[PDB]
């Protein structure tokens, strides 16, 4: 699998991956905040 | 990128992604213990 | 830092005022005396907008709104808390935009190019000045200016349009719209043609003026050519703004009724007024 | 005053000529003419036009659509030429009412609108194929057809794709001057003020941005036109002082700049995104958002009423 | 009402709007990459070493060279990474990176500031037919001035102070774009010297019967120093740049020089 | 009649003719579908 | 204007076999649809 | 009528014909879906 | 493109389209067994 | 039949087919989701 | 069928494929969240 | 993992971190100010 | 701290500083004129 | 930590800091003025 | 790839390691104090 780093420059790969993973993580935290059950800051009951 | 550099990068990359996934798995386990996210037939 | 070709152009001179004192760069930006006065008015007006947000009911960016004085003030200066803030921001914004135009002139002088850009930007300034100064002065109150707020200026557009029953029927507004749509059409065509000539496709050589002219002759039977399209594209954008200004100087200062009812002159023309 | 290069003072003439293309079924039609006033703004040559099979198809479909509209407009004033002129802007051909769904309505109750709309749609899509194939014949990129596809996407969204999502044609656009303006007014009011539709806000930003960019770019190329800047593809393939000074004016003004090629990509994308974001704003209306002001209140655009 | 909902608060229109913002950010990155196909990397203003303030987006900042294929069979790369020499015939008024340069000698002949030009190809622009595009009417017999217009030939050439620089002796026309690009002026001083005058640096004044080509850019003394061209019937892109830059410098330097 | 094919290019004739006849045929089928009596798919009664 | 006879004849064989297959499948499709629901109404409609 | 290929280019013929046939088929399927009797997905009764 | 490689492409193309149609045919069969899509006289 | 690949570029053919088949497939799945009977995610009864 | 990598550049293929697969996956998860039965975050009863 | 500075310019990494961390921190403080429970300036009761 | 003038030109710094201080002074006077307690020209009671 | 000035030009750094810190300070004072408890110019009771 | 030596990379990595540990140490202290003031994981009955 190490051959992938000859197809792609590791510098571009790491910055691209870090950008992708941050935006994905940020989306998931905002999605949870949009729910009642998982918004930890407002903290509704599990009725 | 030389084969020797690619193999060295892959070694560090493999170690790093497994640490990242290991920490994330621990984060998910704690969140599951707090509030699970698969509802039963009656919902939550 | 500099572009690979920049250094040879960074010569002294071309300032309108202030001499050598301001004739320098901060990174990529040229300063000049109108750079300083741009910053003066920009910081003042921006901080006064943020102050108006602190005075107002919400920090939600979309909802922030600094409002002109009540029409009951007429053209008097209002107290700061009662619309005077909007008045200071307005004239600071005029100062900032005028400084920006004059700073562009200095940059044109230094580069030996013509003054078309600050001249064209002068129509943006005149459109803003028409909405916040000329129209409310001719209507006799600052309270006819638009409020400075992301949604509230759109609310003012809505309120102002429906004040004349239906703003689509304003004839100058129809012509303004036509020129805005024509500008976007012409820009789409112009961007596409240059890119299609520069990027003919893999294994193809870059095309030149004969091909560029031939594409629009083949498709639509005319080509304005590479110089004409920049003349046209400029004139279209500036004419769209001029007719926008006219449509607003008509609505309120001159014509006060329903725009749908204005068109009834057409149906009353004697050769078909049965 | 120096020469501002707004109008060509002295203009030259030569034998009319154009780039070669492969022989088709149809030659280039018409005798090339020249007009003096077009030669002041731009090139003087009212050149020949290419027809081709796709051109025949598009014009035939389009002519039939225009006849169906025009005949219905004149029929609506009981064939009177005086009342036609008197009422022209107010005349329109209306889509069918909602009870017909997407089937064929009776001719007088919007069936003619459906036929005219289909024929106009087909003509426009054939004109897209024309704009595409004329570029390939000249061995040029297809950028103009793909820009045109964005305009078509809004046109189709207005006329057909949203009706398909709504299940009927009743809120489609009537063919008529003041009628299509009245449709625009009523559509905004029925869905709770289009100012609060964020994709309409995006579409406006790109509409304003297009006029901004063409004012900036048109003024820029004229400012460097005494340095050869109007010869843009030549400047793209061998950077002259005109392209250097255009870049530096904007860099020194606002801190950043394009190239002579890339400014045309900024131009292309802004005009495209105007109609693309427009089309999305139309397709979301009534299908997933029924009142845009209420959506705006939910998402913080306005205080709760 | 539940119609649009994705969660309690989240809905389809909101999701589609953030999908647009993600696309638009990616498009700006693409557009800024294209903007960097000329002039980059950035250099230190004083030393000319490759330096600038950069974040981690530097790694996506400059694109791989695209190759333009020219109809001569030559190519142009963008970025080509060629850059101007660090030394110029001028010195800074103050030692800071942001300071302006003062010309060491005559800036119009030293080609600094608005007299500066790009080192374009020493090749003429070509017609589609492969002939040189920009040529004197003497060599383009199928071209003519439209019968409605004043022909510039034989008119006096006059500066903004009313001194005669010379007379127009030919038009140079662009065969590809079908326009006048230069007037060929025989000078009044050193008679027999001929110089090119960019046509967009002129207008014809015809308020008085002996109509004339007025030139706002430079004064009559400066015409003797207009850059020369190697051939009598064609002009390279570099020679075009050199000539046009010289006149564009007149608005800043002609009352200095 | 054959002299017509020396006056007109047979390819231009057939393309124009095929275009015209398809558009006309399509128009007529759509017109009949826009009627009660002749819309064969809806199939109203002969009352 | 078109192709020389030999390759016109070559093309015409592959064309003719393809169009006959296409029509053959379409005829079978129309037959099955007719058996399901015919599309010519009687005097009283469907 | 093999001489039709002596009259028209087979490559542009096939591209045009394949496109025409798809558009025509798609139109007919859409027209049928717009009817009660022949919309197979909603499948109304013939009301016997 | 040569004759010999055009014949090579045609063989792999023929193999691929038969697999694609085979999977699609099985997909349609399972959907039909769940809910058929040709109604009877009384509809569904 | 293989001569069709002398007439059309195999790379363009595969790109064209893949684009066409995906857009067609996606259309048909969305059509079925609009129906009551075949919307598998909502799963209405065959009453 | 490994000859497909002589038709297509593996580098561009993987970028396009990963872009396609992510957007498809993201679409499918949002579709499920729009449903009552399969929205796991709101978790309605069956 | 000091080898990461053989991939990346340390100056660019610091510029990137400072930019990212400031905007992330500013986002989190603004999110908390939007809540009742964690808006320290308005200081609602833990009802 | 006199070394600061080996980093910044006295003439430029003085004009920039004078510009900054004037904007700051104007801002504060405008802020006070927006208040009840400190609008000296309106002169509300305490 | 003095090695930071071999990475970053002090002149650039000080201009960046001065701007950033002023904008931040001005933001924080305006935030407090928008509150009931900490607006010192209105001076509401606690 | 960054053009700095192994020695400069190791020198930077030492300072970087100390700096990020200090930054994360202050952040951990900040989070502990906020948790003592108002914890941010709700129980089943909410807050
Ligand atoms: C005081 C008053 C301040 C009013 C508000 C002003 C806001 C903007 C800030 C303006 C000042 C920035 C100054 C700066 O960055 O200088 C860098 C330079 C050292 O740099 P360097 O060594 O030469 O290297 C730089 C180079 O490597 C960077 O790369 P590159 O050269 O390729 O690109 C240059 C950058 C420069 O950008 C700018 O200067 C700002 C650009 C304008 C931003 C406007 C944002 C708001 C509008 C909406 C945004 C929208 C975004 C999407 O180029 C760019 O970044 C260009 C990006 C263009 C994106 C265009 C998108 C258009 C979309 C339109 C909307 C469509 C809607 C559908 O500095 C120095 O030399 C040291 C001395 C100066 C220190 C500056 C300290 C900070 C000053 C901050 C001023 C106060 C701000 C509140
Ligand atoms: C995404 C991978 C990578 C990643 C590490 C990274 C991160 C960040 N960058 Mg960036 N960027 C990367 C790559 C890259 N980058 C830029 C540019 C710019 C300029 C102007 C463009 C603009 O409008 O951006 C638009 C958005 C785009 C292009 C996406 C990245 C930025 C985001 C998500 C932050 C947006 C949030 C803000 C509060 C507003 C920031 C300030 C302004 C726009 C003035 C602007 C100052 C800017 C800000 C930041 C910040 C605040 C961050 C944080 C939070 O980490 N970025 C472009 C430019 O011209 O640079 C001189 C350009 O060429 C280019 C490239 C290739
Ligand atoms: C219920 C509402 C009703 C409804 C029926 C309707 C509909 C439509 N209308 Mg309208 N309209 C209504 C009312 C109404 N209508 C207008 C105007 C128009 C113009 C706008 C452009 C323009 O004017 O740009 C005028 C340009 C200006 C004012 C230039 C301003 C910018 C300047 C100085 C620079 C500012 C720079 C900074 C601050 C720097 C910031 C910092 C940094 C970026 C770093 C245009 C022609 C136009 C278009 C359409 C369309 C396409 C439609 C469709 C599709 O239905 N309309 C305005 C005008 O004419 O203003 C002079 C005006 O006031 C007004 C009113 C009240
Ligand atoms: C009471 C009115 C209300 C109010 C709140 C408001 C106000 C304003 N709005 Mg708006 N608008 C309202 C309603 C509303 N608004 C829009 C749209 C826009 C976009 C159009 C972009 C475009 O290029 O259109 C124009 C392009 C089109 C329609 C597509 C290209 C055209 C094609 C392919 C047709 C080719 C033609 C032929 C071959 C000839 C055939 C011949 C014959 C038929 C005889 C644009 C940006 C825009 C501007 C503004 C401004 C400036 C204002 C101001 C200042 O107030 N508005 C459309 C849309 O995209 O909405 C998302 C749309 O549907 C819709 C609606 C219903
Ligand atoms: C006249 C034809 C078109 C045009 C032309 C044009 N605009 C131009 C130019 C040209 C030729 C420039 O050279 C100049 C420029 O530099 O472009 C990058 C500019 C410009 N056009 C701009 C914007 C702009 N142009 C617009 C329109 C148009 N510009 C026309 C369609 C619009 C619209 C319709 O909405 C906008 C927003 C800027 C990007 C730029 C001018 C930058 C400038 O002046 O900078 C100095 C000032 C500041 C940095 C900020 C000052 C802040 C003030 C103190 C407060 C302002 C408050 C305001 C009154 C209220 C805001 C609230 C809103 C919600 C209403
Ligand atoms: C990107 C968004 C912008 C955009 C872009 C755009 N528009 C475009 C393009 C592009 C890039 C094109 O390539 C295309 C074009 O050709 O431009 C020159 C087009 C186009 N944009 C158009 C219009 C248009 N664009 C608009 C807007 C926009 N266009 C946006 C602002 C608007 C509006 C309302 O804002 C309009 C009205 C057209 C001029 C053109 C597409 C022309 C077309 O499709 O024509 C189809 C054919 C007909 C209408 C039929 C005409 C029939 C004749 C009367 C026949 C007469 C002779 C014949 C032989 C008779 C035969 C009789 C027999 C059959 C009996
Ligand atoms: C590198 O450089 C490049 C060039 O060179 C190499 C170029 O060349 C071009 C190409 C650009 C041009 C040739 C000129 C661009 C100019 C404009 C957009 C501004 C003025 C508008 C136009 C020239 C019209 C544009 C549209 C055209 C030419 C039609 C295209 C379509 C067809 C030929 C077929 C279908 C359409 C037809 C037959 C007619 C369409 C309708 C009109 C043109 C409008 C007619 C008017 C009305 C209907 C009346 C409306 C008004 C009314 C009722 C009230 C007022 C009354 C009036 C009479 C007005 C580009 C982009 C370029 O990059
Ligand atoms: C031939 O093809 C062409 C190209 O090229 C080849 C081109 O490129 C372009 C240009 C087009 C593009 C690149 C496409 C993209 C553009 C658009 C879509 C248009 C929209 C534009 C934007 C969104 C950008 C908006 C940004 C703006 C307006 C700039 C904002 C910046 C400032 C206000 C700062 C200005 C700086 C000044 C005046 C001086 C320097 C100052 C600083 C750097 C910062 C502040 C100051 C200090 C730190 C210190 C100094 C302060 C002092 C002395 C005062 C102190 C006191 C105070 C009160 C502050 C075109 C047209 C073209 O046709
Ligand atoms: C780590 C520990 C500390 C040690 C290190 C400390 C020292 C180093 C710090 C540097 C950061 C500060 C300088 C930022 C500018 C540096 C240059 C820059 O552009 O950086 C980007 C951030 O820009 C920027 O935020 C510039 C922002 C300028 C404008 C700021 C306005 C703020 C005020 C209004 C806000 C509200 C507006 C209204 C919102 C509704 C991030 O990189 P990025 O790769 O994308 O660059 C693109 C380039 O790499 C492409 O070639
Ligand atoms: C012969 O001499 C002349 C030319 C003078 C005759 C006179 C002509 C005149 C005067 C014509 C006047 C025309 C006017 C005034 C037209 C105005 C038009 C305007 C302003 C239109 C604006 C917008 C219209 C839109 C966006 C409509 C779009 C409609 C669409 C896309 C409809 C598509 C429908 C389809 C595909 C239908 C499908 C259903 C089928 C047919 C399959 O089954 C029922
Ligand atoms: Cl002029
Ligand atoms: Fe251009």
Residue numbers in the entry:
A (entry chain F), F (entry chain 6), J (entry chain D), L (entry chain G): 1 to 47
B (entry chain O), I (entry chain I): 12 to 55
C (entry chain L): 2 to 275
D (entry chain M): 2 to 306
E (entry chain H): 1 to 257
G (entry chain 9): 10 to 55
H (entry chain 8): 1 to 48
K (entry chain E), M (entry chain N), N (entry chain J): 1 to 46
Which lines from the publication concern this structure?
Reaction centre-light harvesting complex 1 (RC–LH1) complexes are the central functional units of photosynthesis in purple phototrophic bacteria. Solar energy absorbed by a circular LH1 assembly migrates to an enclosed membrane-bound RC, where a succession of charge separation and protonation events produces a quinol that leaves the RC–LH1 complex, carrying protons and electrons to a cytochrome (cyt) bc1 complex. The LH1 complex is formed from an oligomeric assembly of transmembrane αβ heterodimers, which bind bacteriochlorophyll (BChl) and carotenoid pigments and curve round the central RC complex. In other RC–LH1 complexes the RC is fully encircled by LH1 and there is no obvious entry and exit point for quinone traffic.
Here, we used cryo-EM to determine the structure of the RC–LH1 complex from Rsp. rubrum at 2.5 Å resolution, which shows the detailed organization of all protein and cofactor components, a preferential site for quinone diffusion across the fully circular LH1 complex, and a unique monomeric BChl, with a phospholipid ligand, in the gap between the RC and LH1 complexes. The density map shows the overall shape of the complex, which is slightly elliptical in projection with short and long axes of 115 and 123 Å, and 94 Å in height. LH1α His29 and LH1β His39 supply the ligands (2.6 and 2.5 Å, respectively) for binding a pair of opposing, excitonically coupled BChls. Here, the structure of the RC–LH1 complex shows that the spirilloxanthins in the LH1 ring are in the all-trans configuration, making contacts with the N-terminal helical region (α3-RIWQLF) of the n − 1 α-polypeptide and the transmembrane region (α26-LLIHFILL) of the n + 1 α-polypeptide. Surprisingly, we identified an extra BChl aGG, localized between the second LH1αβ subunit and the RC special pair. This pigment is not bound to a protein, and instead it is coordinated by an oxygen within the headgroup of a neighboring phosphatidylglycerol molecule. The function of this BChl aGG pigment, unique in currently determined RC–LH1 structures, is unknown. Figure 3 displays the distances to neighboring pigments, showing that the extra BChl aGG is located approximately midway between the BChl aGG pair attached to LH1αβ(2) and the RC special pair of BChl aGG pigments, a distance of 42.6 Å, with its macrocycle tilted ∼60° from the special pair. Four quinone molecules were identified: QA, QB and Qp are assigned as ubiquinone-10, based on their well-resolved densities. The head group of the QP quinone in the Rsp. rubrum LH1 makes lone pair π interactions with the backbone oxygen of RC-L Leu 76, and the isoprenyl tail makes contacts with LH1α4 and 5.
